[PDB]
Design a protein around this ligand. Structure first.
Ligand SMILES: *[C@@H]1O[C@H](CO)[C@@H](O[C@@H]2O[C@H](CO)[C@@H](O[C@@H]3O[C@H](CO[C@H]4O[C@H](CO)[C@@H](O)[C@H](O)[C@@H]4O)[C@@H](O)[C@H](O[C@H]4O[C@H](CO)[C@@H](O)[C@H](O)[C@@H]4O)[C@@H]3O)[C@H](O)[C@H]2NC(C)=O)[C@H](O)[C@H]1NC(C)=O
Ligand SMILES: *[C@@H]1O[C@H](CO)[C@@H](O[C@@H]2O[C@H](CO)[C@@H](O[C@@H]3O[C@H](CO)[C@@H](O)[C@H](O[C@H]4O[C@H](CO)[C@@H](O)[C@H](O)[C@@H]4O)[C@@H]3O)[C@H](O)[C@H]2NC(C)=O)[C@H](O)[C@H]1NC(C)=O
Ligand SMILES: *[C@@H]1O[C@H](CO)[C@@H](O[C@@H]2O[C@H](CO)[C@@H](O[C@@H]3O[C@H](CO[C@H]4O[C@H](CO)[C@@H](O)[C@H](O)[C@@H]4O)[C@@H](O)[C@H](O)[C@@H]3O)[C@H](O)[C@H]2NC(C)=O)[C@H](O)[C@H]1NC(C)=O
Ligand SMILES: *[C@@H]1O[C@H](CO)[C@@H](O[C@@H]2O[C@H](CO)[C@@H](O[C@@H]3O[C@H](CO[C@H]4O[C@H](CO)[C@@H](O)[C@H](O)[C@@H]4O)[C@@H](O)[C@H](O)[C@@H]3O)[C@H](O)[C@H]2NC(C)=O)[C@H](O)[C@H]1NC(C)=O
Ligand SMILES: *[C@@H]1O[C@H](CO)[C@@H](O[C@@H]2O[C@H](CO)[C@@H](O)[C@H](O)[C@H]2NC(C)=O)[C@H](O)[C@H]1NC(C)=O
Ligand SMILES: *[C@@H]1O[C@H](CO)[C@@H](O[C@@H]2O[C@H](CO)[C@@H](O)[C@H](O)[C@H]2NC(C)=O)[C@H](O)[C@H]1NC(C)=O
Ligand SMILES: Cc1cccc(-c2ccnc3c(C(N)=O)cnn23)c1
Ligand SMILES: Cc1cccc(-c2ccnc3c(C(N)=O)cnn23)c1
Ligand SMILES: *[C@@H]1O[C@H](CO)[C@@H](O)[C@H](O)[C@H]1NC(C)=O
Ligand SMILES: *[C@@H]1O[C@H](CO)[C@@H](O)[C@H](O)[C@H]1NC(C)=O
Ligand SMILES: *[C@@H]1O[C@H](CO)[C@@H](O)[C@H](O)[C@H]1NC(C)=O
Ligand SMILES: *[C@@H]1O[C@H](CO)[C@@H](O)[C@H](O)[C@H]1NC(C)=O
Ligand SMILES: *[C@@H]1O[C@H](CO)[C@@H](O)[C@H](O)[C@H]1NC(C)=O
Ligand SMILES: *[C@@H]1O[C@H](CO)[C@@H](O)[C@H](O)[C@H]1NC(C)=O
Lengths: 739, 750
C-alpha cells in the first residue's frame, strides 16, 4: 500500500499521484518501477542528489507549485536519471535555470518562476528538448526590466519543436532560433516590431503567437501598457515570407488598424487566424487580406468595437465570400443595432460555414430569415444581444479566445442550434420564430421571460428536441404547455419563478421526453393533479424544491408524486429540506430507479429495509444529511447497490461486516462522519474515510491491519485520515502510527 | 428579572414580549404590572379561564400563530374574566369557530387565518364596543369552507364598528344589515361578482371600500385564481355608490374591468386613492370619461393592464388626465409599450402637484427625455425594467399595490430622483443624460454597464449627490472617473466586476481623492485584491467606507508591505466595514494604520484566530468593535488599559471558552457585551469583579454550552445582584451538561 502516494498501473507504465499532500520532502517511501511522479502542490523546499536515489525508471517528474523564498535545487540533482524525459518545474520561485539537467529531457517546463537569464550553461546541453516552456518569468516586475537571452542559446536545440516565451519582456524576437521550430509562442513580450530577419527560415513553423504586443488596453481587466500613442504592432511586409506551413496565427490585441495582405502571400495553408481586440472595423468593411486565405477554417474578429459607438449596421466586405474553407466565424463584440439580409450576403455562399458567433453585439433586430439562405449552419450563437418579442488565470489557458464550446454539446448534438439567451425576449411574440430554419436545440435562458405557455408559441419550429428555458419566469400551468414540441427530449426549467402553485400535467403529453430539470422552482404544492406521469422520462432533477412540504401533506395527496414516471432511472431530490421521508412515499418512488440522490437535506433517519423495493438501484447518494445509524444487514436489502455515498453525516458506529456482504458494493464513502474507530469487520475498490475523528489508541490496530490485508481496496487522501485523540496523536495520520 | 418574557416600560405602561419562545402554556410567572402580553409564535395548545388568572389589568393579548409545526383549544368564557381586555389577537390559530363568551370590553378583535365558516350572533353580537373586527382569510381557496355563513344582522348590533374586514372568504354577496358606523369595509377576494344598488346603504360614513379580486384577472396569476364566467368583469350597478359621499379610498384591482362607469363617481367628490391595477383598461386609459369625475384624486394606480401577446409602439393617454388636478402620484407599471414621445404625456404636464410618475416594467425602448423638464413638481421618475439603450402570505400587507418606497429614501432625500435600473444601458452614451432636469439621485443599477469612466459621462447632470452604480461592470481606473460630479456625497459600487466574469481584475482608486464632500463609498464585493501604481485610499471628506467582500487577506499579506496604509489617508473616517475579507491575521502595523478617527469598526465574518487588544490604544474614539463570526480563542485580562472609549463589543460566534478574572471589571465605558454562541461552560466570579462598578447594561450569553452546575451558582447569584444588566433571550441561555439538566434554561436551577 503506497504511502503517502497513490500508485496506479496505466498502459505499460506505472504512475504515482503524490500531489496536494502537505509533504515537506521527496518521500523515500516512493519506489520503484514508478515511472511518473506527481509531487505538485506540496511544501517541498529542497531537491538533492538523494531526493531521487536509484529511481532510474523515472520518466516524468512534476514538482510544480512547491512550496506553498522558494525551491532549492542542487546542481545535477536530476543528472542521475538516465530515462528522464519530462520535468515540470512551474511556480517554484526559481531564480535561474537549474544546473546540469540530464540531456535525456524531451520536455522542460519552467513557467512562473523568476528566471531573468536564459543561458548556454542552462539549456545548451539539452539537445533532445522537443518542448521548452519559459513563459511568465519576467512579467510586470521592477527587478527584471528585460529578460536576457544569451546569443544562440537555442541554436544548439536542433530537435526543438515548441518554444514558449510568452509573458516576459523581450523587446525583440531572439535571433538564432533552430529551424526545427514548429510552434513559437511570443504573447505579451513587448515586441513592437517584427523584421524580415526574425522568422527567416523557420520553414517548419505551424504556429506563431504574437498576441498582446502593442495591446488594445481599453477596458482591459489585467494591467496593460499600450505602445506609444496606442500604435499598432509593426510587422514588416516580408516578415512571414518563408512560413509556408503556418496553420495558426494569433495577432489578438496588437492594436491593428490595417492588415497587410502580403503577410499571407506565402501562407496558403493558414487554418486559424485570430484578430480579436484590435481596431479592424474598417478592415472588416474592405478587407483585401480576405482574398489571401482560401484554406482558413476559423476566423476570429471579436471585440473590435469602437468606443462610444453603437452603429446601426455591421459592414461586412464582399471579400468574405473568398473564404471558401471557412467553418467558424466569430464576430463577438462588434456592437451594432440591426442585422439585415444583405449584410451577410458574402457568407451565404461559403459551403462549410457551420458556426456564426454573434454573441455580445447588443443587436436589437435581426432579419431572421437570412439564416435560411445558408447550406450548412449548425450553430447560431446570439447570446447577449437585444432581441425583443416579435409581434409584427492559467498559463496553459487561452488568455483571449474561448476554451469552451459555444453551446452545450448535449444540445448541439441534436442538430441545428440557436442560442438567444440573455436577450430581451420578455415574452414569446407570435412571430418570434417565424423565419427560422428547422431548429433542434434552442436556448432561451435568462430573458426575464414570463410567457403563459399555451401550446402554440413554438409551432413554427416544432422539431426542437433540447429546449433550455432556465432562469425565466414562465407559466406552465396549462396542460397544453410546450406540447406542440412533440419530439422534445430534453427540457430545462431550472430557476424558474414568478415576477406560487404548479400544475405539472403538461409532462404526460410527450412521447419522447427523456430529461426534465425542475431544479430550484420552489415547488411546494400542485393543483388538481398530484401525480407526475410519463412513460418515456428517464431523468428527473427536482433539487431545490419543497418535498418536505409536499410529503407532510395532511391528506397524503403526494405519496405517489413520482410513481407514474414508469421509465425513471435517475432521480435528484437534493436540497429539498427533507427531515423524514414517510415510508410509503419512499416505496412509491419508481422501482425502475438506478441512481437516487437525496443529498443535502436534513435526514435524521433512513429506512434501509426499503431498498428491497428497488432491485435496480446502483447508486444511493445520501451525503450532507444528519444520519446516525447504518443497518447491520445491507446485503439482505440489496444485491444491486454499487455506490453508496454517506459523507457529511453523523455516523459514529460502523456495524460489523459492513465491508463484508453486501458484496455488490464497489465504492463506499464515509468521509466526514463521527467514526472514532473501525473494529469487527473485498469486492470493494474504494473506501473513503478522511475527516473522521479517529481515536488512535491501540484499538485502531485492527483496522490498520485490515488495510494491509486488503490492498485491492483503495483509500484516497490517506494523509487526511487523521487522529483526533488522544492528544499526543492528535493531527497525525492513522497510517503513520506504530505498534 | 422577568422570565420567560422580556418585560419593559413602553409609554406609560408595561409590556411583556413573550413571543417565539417555545412555550407550551401561558406562563404564570408574568410580571404583575403587565397590561399587554405578546405570546405569539409559541407552542401553546390550551387556553382556560385559569390561563390568565392573576392578570386582571390585561388590556391587550396577542396569541397569534399558536401552536407551531390541531389548533388552539379555547374554553368557553376563557377571557370573560378580564374586565379591561380591549384588543385580542387570535390569528393563525386553526380555530373552527368564534370562541364563545368573549368579554364585551373588546374594541379590537382579530380572527384572521383560522377555519371559521360561521359568523354567528352569540359569537360577536354583544361585543357592542368593537371598533375594528378582522375576519379575513378564513375560507381561502382550499377547500372547505363551503361558503361562509353570515347570520342575518350579526353586525347590526355593533353600533360603534368602524372597520370590518371579511376579505379572502367566499361570500358571493355583500352581507346585509351593516352598521352605519362603518368607515372601512374590506371585501377583497370574496367572490362577489355583482354589486346592487342596495348593497352599500346606509353606509353614509364609509371612507374606504375594497372590492379587489372579485372576478379576478387570472392571467399569469401567482396565487390560485378563479375568474368569473368568460372574461367578465365584476358587475356594479350604476347607482351602487350613489350614497357613499364620504369615500376616500376605492380599490377595484383585479376585477376584470374593461369599462369604468363615470356615474359611479358622481356623488363621491372626495375620492383620494383609486386602485385599478390588474384590469383590462387600455381602452379606458385612452378615452377615460371617468377621469373628469375625480378632481380630488391624489393617487391613481393603473398598473398591469397590459394586453397579452401585445407590445404596442405607443401608449395612448386620454386628454382627460388633465382633469386630475389633485394628482400627486401616477402608477403606470406594466402597460407595456415601446416608445414614449413628448406629446403622449402632455395632459400630465399641467397637473400642479404631480410629484411621482411610475413607469416601471413597461419595456420601453425609447423615451424623449426632455418631456420631463415640463413638470414643475416631479420629484420621482421611476423607469426601472424598461429597455433604454445607450444614446449616441401576510394578510396585513397590500396584496396588489407593492408598498415600499419606489426609491430608497436616503437617495430621494437629496432631491429629484431618476431610476433607470435594469434597463439596457450597457455603456453610457455621450447623449445619455441630455435634456434631463436636474437630477440629485440617480440609479443605474444592473444595466451590464461597462463604461470606462473618464470624467465626462455625467456632465449634463453634474449635480448628482447619490449615485447607485451597483451590479455593473464599470472601469473606474482613470483617476478622472466621476470627477465631473463634484457634489457627490454617496457612491454605491457594490458588486461591480469586469465584463468577462474573469477573475484577476486590478483596481486604481485614485479617483476618490478628488471629491471634497464625498461621505459614503460602498466597494462591497468588488473582489479587490491588488491596486495598481497607488496603494492608498485618500479623502479628507469620507466618513463611511464599506469594504466587505474583497481580499484584504491578500492585500495585507503582501511581501513588500505595499498596503500597510491603504486606509490611513481617509482622515475623517468614522465607520469602516471589513467583513467578509477572509482575514486570518491582521498585521499589527496595518491595524495601527487604520484611521484614528474611527468610531465603528466591523471585522465580522472573517476567520480571525487572534486579536491584539493592545492596539485599541491607538483609537481613542472607538465606540463599537464588531468581531462576530470569527475564530477567536481569548480575551485580554484588562481591556480597561487599552481603551477608555469602547461602548459596544460584539464577539458572538467565536471560540471563547474562558472569561478573564478582572475582565468586565474596572472601566466601565462598556455598555454592551455580546458573547452569545461561544464555548463558555461557566463564568467564575472575576470576571465577576467589583467594586467599580461596571457600567454594563447588556450582556448576551445565549448559545453557550453551560455546565449547570453548581460551579454556576456564583454567576446565577451575580445575576440576581445586578438586575440592571439586561440579559436577553434568557430561554436560550441553556445548560449543555449534565442533561438531566441539558436543555433547561440556566435560571431554572435551585
Ligand atoms: C452600500 O453601503 C451603504 C452604506 O452602509 C448602504 O446604505 C446604507 O444602508 C444601511 C442599512 O443597511 C442604512 O442604514 C439604515 O438606515 C435606516 C434608515 O434610517 C432612518 O431612521 C434613522 C434613525 O436613526 C434616521 O437616522 C434616518 O434618517 C432614517 O429615517 C435605519 O432604519 C436602519 O436602522 C438600523 O438600526 C436599527 C437600530 O436602531 C435596527 O433596528 C435596524 O434594523 C437597522 O439595523 C439602518 O441604520 C444606511 O442609511 C444606508 N446609507 C445610505 C447613505 O444609503 C448600502 O445599502 C450599500 N449598498 C448595498 C447594495 O448593499
Ligand atoms: C385595496 O386598497 C386599499 C387602499 O385603498 C388597501 O387598504 C390598505 O390595506 C393595508 C394593508 O392591510 C393597510 O395597511 C396597514 O395599516 C394598518 C393601520 O395603520 C397597519 O397596522 C399595518 O401595518 C402593520 O403591518 C405592516 C405589514 O404587515 C407593517 O409594515 C407594520 O409594521 C405594522 O405591523 C398596515 O400598514 C392600509 O391601512 C389600508 N389603507 C387604508 C386603510 O387606507 C388594501 O389593502 C387594498 N387591498 C388589497 C387586497 O391589496
Ligand atoms: C493565440 O492563439 C493560439 C492559437 O490557437 C493559442 O494557442 C493555444 O494555446 C493553448 C493554451 O496555451 C494550448 O492549449 C493547450 O494544449 C495542450 C496540448 O493538447 C493536445 O492534447 C489534447 C488533449 O485534450 C488535444 O485535445 C489537443 O488536440 C492537443 O494535441 C494541452 O496540454 C493543454 O492542457 C492546453 O489545452 C493550445 O494547444 C494552443 N493551440 C495550439 C498549440 O495549436 C494561444 O494560446 C493564443 N494566445 C493567447 C495568449 O491566448
Ligand atoms: C438540469 O439537469 C440536466 C440533467 O441532469 C443537466 O444537464 C446534465 O448535466 C450533467 C453535468 O451536470 C451532464 O453530465 C456530464 O456530461 C459530461 C459529458 O460527457 C461525455 O462523455 C460521456 C460518457 O458517458 C458521454 O455519454 C457524453 O455524451 C459526453 O461525450 C461528463 O463529462 C460529465 O462527467 C457529466 O456526465 C449531462 O450530460 C447533462 N445532461 C443533459 C441532457 O444535458 C443540466 O445541467 C441541468 N441544468 C442546470 C441549469 O443545472
Ligand atoms: C444557455 O445559455 C446559458 C447562458 O449563457 C448557459 O449557461 C451557462 O452554462 C454554463 C455550463 O452549464 C455555466 O458554466 C455558465 O455559468 C452559464 N452561464 C450563465 C451566464 O448562466 C447555458 O449552458 C446555455 N445552455 C445550453 C444548452 O447551451
Ligand atoms: C436601484 O435599483 C435597484 C434594483 O432595482 C434597487 O435594488 C433593490 O434594492 C432593494 C432595497 O435595498 C432590495 O430589497 C431589492 O431586492 C433590490 N433589487 C435588486 C434586483 O437588487 C436599489 O435599491 C435601487 N437603489 C436605490 C438607491 O433606490
Ligand atoms: C462588447 C462590449 C460590451 C460592453 C460594452 C461595449 C462598449 C461599446 C461601446 N462603448 C463602450 C464603452 C465606452 N464607451 O466607454 C465601454 N464599453 N463599451 C462593448
Ligand atoms: C408586465 C409584463 C411583464 C412581463 C411580460 C408581460 C407580457 C406582455 C405581453 N404578453 C405577455 C405574456 C404572454 N403573452 O403570455 C406573458 N407576459 N406578457 C407583461
Ligand atoms: C540551498 O540549500 C543550501 C543548503 O541546504 C543552502 O546553503 C542555500 O541557502 C540554498 N541555496 C541558495 C542558492 O540559496
Ligand atoms: C425508456 O428508456 C429506455 C432506455 O433509455 C429506452 O430504450 C426506451 O425507448 C424508453 N421507453 C419509452 C416508452 O420511451
Ligand atoms: C358618522 O360620522 C361622524 C364622525 O365623522 C359621527 O359623529 C357619527 O356618529 C357617525 N355615524 C355613526 C356612528 O352612525
Ligand atoms: C397641492 O398641494 C398643496 C399642499 O400639499 C395643497 O395645499 C394644494 O391644495 C394642492 N393643490 C391642489 C390642486 O390640490
Ligand atoms: C468629519 O465627519 C463629521 C461627521 O462624522 C463632521 O461633523 C466633520 O465636520 C467632518 N470633518 C471633516 C474635516 O470633513
Ligand atoms: C501588539 O502590538 C504591539 C505593537 O505596538 C506589539 O509590541 C505587541 O507585541 C503586540 N501584542 C501581541 C499580543 O501580539
Amino acid at each position: 500500500r503506497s504511502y503517502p502516494c497513490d500508485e496506479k498501473k496505466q498502459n505499460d507504465s506505472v504512475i504515482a499521484e503524490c500531489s496536494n499532500r502537505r509533504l515537506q520532502e521527496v518521500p523515500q517511501t516512493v519506489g520503484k518501477y514508478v515511472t511518473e511522479l506527481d509531487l505538485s502542490d506540496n511544501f517541498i523546499t529542497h531537491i538533492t542528489n538523494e531526493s531521487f536515489q536509484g529511481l532510474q525508471n523515472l520518466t516524468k517528474i512534476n514538482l510544480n507549485h512547491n512550496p506553498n523564498n522558494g525551491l532549492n535545487i542542487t546542481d545535477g540533482a536530476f543528472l542521475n536519471l538516465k530515462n528522464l524525459r519530462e520535468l515540470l518545474l512551474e511556480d517554484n520561485q526559481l531564480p535561474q535555470i537549474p544546473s546540469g539537467l540530464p540531456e535525456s529531457l524531451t520536455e522542460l517546463s519552467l513557467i512562473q518562476n523568476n528566471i531573468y537569464n536564459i543561458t548556454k550553461e542552462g539549456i545548451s546541453r539539452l539537445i533532445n528538448l522537443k518542448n521548452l516552456y519559459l513563459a511568465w518569468n519576467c512579467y510586470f516586475n521592477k527587478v527584471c526590466e528585460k529578460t536576457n537571452i544569451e546569443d544562440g542559446v537555442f541554436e544548439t536545440l536542433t530537435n526543438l519543436e515548441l518554444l514558449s516565451l510568452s509573458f516576459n519582456s523581450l523587446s525583440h524576437v531572439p535571433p538564432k532560433l533552430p529551424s526545427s521550430l514548429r510552434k513559437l509562442f511570443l504573447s505579451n513580450t513587448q515586441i513592437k516590431y517584427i523584421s524580415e530577419e526574425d522568422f527567416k527560415g523557420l520553414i517548419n513553423l505551424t504556429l506563431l503567437d504574437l498576441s498582446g504586443n502593442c495591446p488594445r488596453c481599453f477596458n482591459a481587466p489585467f494591467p496593460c501598457v499600450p505602445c506609444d500613442g496606442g500604435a499598432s504592432i509593426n510587422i514588416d511586409r516580408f516578415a512571414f515570407q518563408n512560413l509556408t506551413q503556418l496553420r495558426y496565427l494569433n495577432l489578438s490585441s496588437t492594436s491593428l488598424r490595417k492588415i497587410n495582405a502580403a503577410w499571407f502571400k506565402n501562407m496558403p495553408h493558414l487554418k486559424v487566424l485570430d484578430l480579436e481586440f484590435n481596431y479592424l472595423v474598417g478592415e472588416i468593411a474592405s478587407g483585401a487580406f480576405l482574398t489571401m486565405l482560401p484554406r482558413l477554417e476559423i476566423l476570429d474578429l471579436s471585440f473590435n468595437y469602437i468606443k462610444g459607438s453603437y452603429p446601426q449596421h455591421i459592414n461586412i466586405s464582399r471579400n468574405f465570400s473568398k473564404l471558401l474553407s471557412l467553418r467558424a466565424l466569430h464576430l463577438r463584440g462588434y456592437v451594432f443595432q440591426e442585422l439585415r439580409e444583405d449584410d451577410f450576403q458574402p457568407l451565404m455562399q461559403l459551403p462549410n460555414l457551420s458556426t456564426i458567433n454573434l454573441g455580445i453585439n447588443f443587436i436589437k433586430q435581426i432579419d431572421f430569415k437570412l439564416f435560411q439562405n445558408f447550406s450548412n449552419l449548425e450553430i447560431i450563437y446570439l447570446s447577449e444581444n437585444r432581441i425583443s418579442p416579435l409581434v409584427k488565470f492559467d498559463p496553459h489557458s487561452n488568455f483571449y479566445h474561448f476554451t469552451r464550446p459555444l453551446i452545450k454539446p448535449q444540445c448541439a448534438a441534436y442538430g441545428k442550434a440557436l442560442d438567444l439567451s440573455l436577450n430581451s425576449i420578455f415574452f414569446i411574440g407570435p412571430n418570434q420564430f417565424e423565419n427560422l430554419p428547422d431548429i433542434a436545440c434552442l436556448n432561451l435562458s435568462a430573458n426575464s421571460n414570463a410567457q403563459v405557455l399555451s401550446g402554440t408559441e413554438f409551432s413554427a419550429i416544432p422539431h426542437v428536441k433540447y429546449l433550455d428555458l432556465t432562469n425565466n419566469r414562465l407559466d406552465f400551468d396549462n396542460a397544453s404547455a410546450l406540447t406542440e414540441l412533440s419530439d422534445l427530449e430534453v427540457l430545462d426549467l431550472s430557476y424558474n419563478s414568478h415576477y406560487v402553485t404548479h400544475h405539472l400535467e403538461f409532462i404526460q403529453n410527450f412521447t419522447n421526453l427523456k430529461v426534465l430539470n425542475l431544479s430550484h422552482n420552489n415547488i411546494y404544492t400542485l393543483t388538481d393533479k398530484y401525480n407526475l406521469e410519463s412513460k418515456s422520462l428517464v431523468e428527473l432533477v427536482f433539487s431545490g424544491n419543497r418535498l418536505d412540504i409536499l410529503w407532510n401533506d395532511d391528506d397524503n395527496r403526494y405519496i405517489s408524486i413520482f410513481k407514474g414516471l414508469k421509465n425513471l432511472t435517475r432521480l435528484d431530490l437534493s436540497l429539498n429540506r427533507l427531515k423524514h421521508i414517510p415510508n410509503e412515499a419512499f416505496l412509491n418512488l419508481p422501482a425502475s430507479l438506478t441512481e437516487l440522490h437525496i443529498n443535502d437535506n436534513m435526514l435524521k433517519f433512513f429506512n434501509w429495509t426499503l431498498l428491497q423495493q428497488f432491485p435496480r438501484l446502483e447508486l444511493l447518494d445520501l451525503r450532507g444529511n444528519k444520519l446516525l445509524f447504518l443497518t447491520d444487514s445491507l446485503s439482505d436489502f440489496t444485491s444491486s447497490l454499487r455506490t453508496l455515498l454517506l459523507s457529511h453525516n453523523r455516523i459514529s458506529h460502523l456495524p460489523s461486516g459492513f465491508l463484508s456482504e453486501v458484496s455488490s458494493l464497489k465504492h463506499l464513502d464515509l468521509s466526514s462522519n463521527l467514526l472514532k474507530t473501525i473494529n469487527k469487520s473485498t469486492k470493494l475498490s474504494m473506501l473513503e474515510l478522511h475527516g473522521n475523528p479517529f481515536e488512535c489508541t491501540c484499538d485502531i490496530g485492527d483496522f490498520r491491519r485490515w488495510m494491509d490485508e486488503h490492498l485491492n481496496v483503495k483509500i484516497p487522501r490517506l494523509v487526511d485520515v487523521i487522529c483526533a485523540s488522544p492528544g499526543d496523536q492528535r493531527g497525525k495520520s492513522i497510517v503513520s502510527l506504530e505498534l
